[PDB]
Structure 1
Amino acid sequence: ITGLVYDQRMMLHHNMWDSHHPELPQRISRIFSRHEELRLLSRCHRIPARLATEEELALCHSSKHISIIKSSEHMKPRDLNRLGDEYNSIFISNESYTCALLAAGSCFNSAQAILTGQVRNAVAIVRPPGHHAEKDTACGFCFFNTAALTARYAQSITRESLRVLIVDWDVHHGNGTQHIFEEDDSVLYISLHRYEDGAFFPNSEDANYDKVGLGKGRGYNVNIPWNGGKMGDPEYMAAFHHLVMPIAREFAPELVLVSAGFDAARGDPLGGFQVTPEGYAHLTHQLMSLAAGRVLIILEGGFNLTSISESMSMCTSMLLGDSPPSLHLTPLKTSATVSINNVLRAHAPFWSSLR
């Protein structure tokens, strides 16, 4: 069966200076409501949220970073503003730390539910997001790297070398996730993201296809960067067909984590892409063929409330075993073919399935 975790307390994190900032509290309540409306909620096993512990945060983050974000709990508005401004694209309220702990702890409980056999797969409707967060810093609406921490947490209750695949289909590069595992061959990081040769957030060449990992982790970092404007279902289905799925099958993960931002969705003001809810359903359904179905979908970005609610609900529908909706309709944009070919050339030395 399918687990679901959601806790309205994660809505308390808010922007006190700009109440229309796109990373809204109602992102998670709208997704939760849509699950209820589509009668998906009643079909799931409800997994309780919990706080991550500071020891658990230290799986990926420095004690300094943990301490600094923790300290924000007690700050007056002026110092919250000052601290937030020390990072790239961060706002902080007194509730932020607690919400970031709940987001992480919720995902640990979800991974635990899967790994103990209580559920086969699970969805986590959480905020604030995580994948921009680095070992030592907050970034891009993210405080702690929830997905990265969850991979380590999974390893901490099974085997240090448990093979974890992280598929990051948030429209942005998960810079923090890449860096945390860059020298690691136990965690395969595969990200699809708008890149625009560095013009798209977070604006680093770290996100390019030629960054394939370091040391023993060489080959275990797969960046699929998009250039030249809007991409959609055809391009994402093709990237999964040619790259994500062949590499994933060869890696043979024992657990799949999805950094599931829905900002590549049709309608997203930040992403500018047009992946459909049906498209996200097919991506989910493909990932379910891995790791004996052990997949945990973790909300990252995604800022059109209707788009993210429809899209994530479709993912949960697939997890629950529903038939994929009818769909990949068009030839690829030429720059997407170039992107896919660039990644294939970059990773053929490491994956026999690409040769």
Structure 2
Amino acid sequence: SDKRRVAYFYDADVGNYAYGAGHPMKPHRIRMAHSLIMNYGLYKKMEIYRAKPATKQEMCQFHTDEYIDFLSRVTPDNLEMFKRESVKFNVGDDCPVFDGLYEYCSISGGGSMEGAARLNRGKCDVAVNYAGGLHHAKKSEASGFCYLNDIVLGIIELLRYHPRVLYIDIDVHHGDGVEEAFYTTDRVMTCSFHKYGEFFPGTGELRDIGVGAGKNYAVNVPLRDGIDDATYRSVFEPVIKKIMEWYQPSAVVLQCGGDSLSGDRLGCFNLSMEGHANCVNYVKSFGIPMMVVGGGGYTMRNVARTWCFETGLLNNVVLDKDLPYNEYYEYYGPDYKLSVRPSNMFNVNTPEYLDKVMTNIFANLENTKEEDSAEAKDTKGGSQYARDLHV
């Protein structure tokens, strides 16, 4: 809607990491999203930024000392001797290790703290971090099939400028660690959309809205196996409208998870480009400070398509469906158009069930009313452009 200054941080090292063979969750989607953004000519209203690797003693702001020290010491050649810390944090059993793991966590946490600092100094209204998005882990855990929770690393880094923080999770495999870390405090409100069925987090309920000062201030909605665009609009607009009319947040952290797209390895939702765009569009419509972060997406074509669409609209330009030639020209679909087609799969959700969720949510919410900190030390990294327009 209104004109906004959108900042986007990307590290080239994020792309060249492979989690493993047969691995759905992977970092290669970030480099192709970056390439699509670079080749779509979005640089006219954008600035490029380089994500500095996370400093060790500031990385420990969320996690424990031994967990970070293990992550900086973990590698495939010594995982066999690392058995205790391998099984203690669910590392190598469900989430295998690889070369450059600590590098990935460092650059992801650096990008998240960079977005938080850009929010703090206020030069850019919106920060986009596709490089991070690791949003399932916990203080001493790699559960939820990831390794870090860099959103909660970036949320508290923006607490100093933003007292009230609002977080939204729209993809499946919701933010167990995100709502867990900010359970008992009203300062950060965690909203998450997920399905009751068993997922990588597994958690999420309708009665776990908070304890202590954070009571009634962490709303979770249990959804069903696939939502139509109209039903998702009817379940998203009133809830977020009531939240912004009651909570009065001063910041928004939006999880741009591609896991809820029409067809991926573990996703089970059926939203098209319109359905995924309205989540960001609605929370953009209030103009309060914003931080877009993305970690979801098991299929490259769908998550790259929706990330290019989000990058397009976020700058208030008309993003066309045609894809310019790039290194991934023969990648996205047969017709090579930027549109994720919603599958012909049934709408399990009920309007009566949605109305019941609305009524109990409204009745729930009616009762309520470190040597480098706050720093933006980085480099633009736009001197050389790797635009491959030649076959």
Class of the TM-score when normalised by the shorter of the 2 chains: 0.7 to 0.9
Q: What's the offset of the Cα at 1:321?
A: 2.0
The aligned counterpart of 2:49 is 47
- Seen in structure 2, the aligned counterparts of structure 1 residues 336 and 122 have a Cα distance that, compared at 3 Å, is farther
- Seen in structure 2, the aligned counterparts of structure 1 residues 44 and 334 have a Cα distance that, compared at 3 Å, is same
Identify the match of residue 105 of structure 1 among 105, 110, 114.
Answer: 110
Aligned residues: 339
Matched, 1:221 2:201: no
% identical aligned pairs: 24
Cα separation, 2, equivalents of 1:338 and 1:79? 51
SS of the residue 1:91 aligns to: coil
- Seen in structure 2, the aligned counterparts of structure 1 residues 215 and 82 have a Cα distance that, compared at 3 Å, is closer
**2:6·2:124 contact (CA, 8 Å) conserved in 1?**
yes
The aligned counterpart of 2:281 is 285
The aligned counterpart of 1:148 is 152
Q: What's the offset of the Cα at 1:90?
A: 1.5
Q: What's the offset of the Cα at 1:262?
A: 0.9
Cα separation, 2, equivalents of 1:146 and 1:211? 23
| Structure number, greater radius of gyration | 2
The aligned counterpart of 2:207 is 210
Matched, 1:182 2:183: yes
SS of the residue 1:166 aligns to: strand
- Seen in structure 2, the aligned counterparts of structure 1 residues 274 and 52 have a Cα distance that, compared at 3 Å, is same
Cα separation, 2, equivalents of 1:240 and 1:324? 23
Cα separation, 1, equivalents of 2:355 and 2:261? 20
CA distances 1:128-148 after superposition (whole Å, capped 9, x unpaired) = x42211112112232221111
Cα separation, 1, equivalents of 2:105 and 2:313? 27
SS of the residue 1:29 aligns to: helix
Identify the match of residue 135 of structure 1 among 112, 136, 139.
Answer: 139
- Seen in structure 2, the aligned counterparts of structure 1 residues 130 and 334 have a Cα distance that, compared at 3 Å, is closer
Give the 5 Å matches for 1:189-268.
189-196=190-197, 199-204=198-203, 207-227=204-224, 229-268=225-264
**2:75·2:97 contact (CA, 8 Å) conserved in 1?**
no
CA distances 1:206-253 after superposition (whole Å, capped 9, x unpaired) = x011110110000111101113x2223223212211212321332121
SS of the residue 1:348 aligns to: helix
Cα separation, 1, equivalents of 2:318 and 2:146? 34
**1:131·1:300 contact (CA, 8 Å) conserved in 2?**
yes
- Seen in structure 2, the aligned counterparts of structure 1 residues 340 and 232 have a Cα distance that, compared at 3 Å, is same
TM-score by length of structure 2 reads: 0.78
Cα separation, 1, equivalents of 2:129 and 2:53? 14
Identify the match of residue 62 of structure 2 among 60, 63, 70.
Answer: 60
**2:256·2:296 contact (CA, 8 Å) conserved in 1?**
yes
The aligned counterpart of 1:341 is 356
Amino acid at match of 2:214: G
TM-score by length of structure 1 reads: 0.86
Cα separation, 2, equivalents of 1:317 and 1:295? 16
SS of the residue 1:274 aligns to: coil
Cα separation, 1, equivalents of 2:140 and 2:355? 32
CA distances 1:142-166 after superposition (whole Å, capped 9, x unpaired) = 222111111101114x36xx11111
Give the 5 Å matches for 1:29-40.
29-40=31-42
Higher helix share: 1
- Seen in structure 2, the aligned counterparts of structure 1 residues 119 and 233 have a Cα distance that, compared at 3 Å, is same
Cα separation, 2, equivalents of 1:222 and 1:343? 11
Cα separation, 2, equivalents of 1:28 and 1:336? 36
Q: What's the offset of the Cα at 1:192?
A: 0.4
SS of the residue 2:158 aligns to: helix
Q: What's the offset of the Cα at 1:83?
A: 5.3
The aligned counterpart of 2:316 is 321
- Seen in structure 2, the aligned counterparts of structure 1 residues 82 and 305 have a Cα distance that, compared at 3 Å, is farther
Give the 5 Å matches for 1:109-120.
109-120=114-125
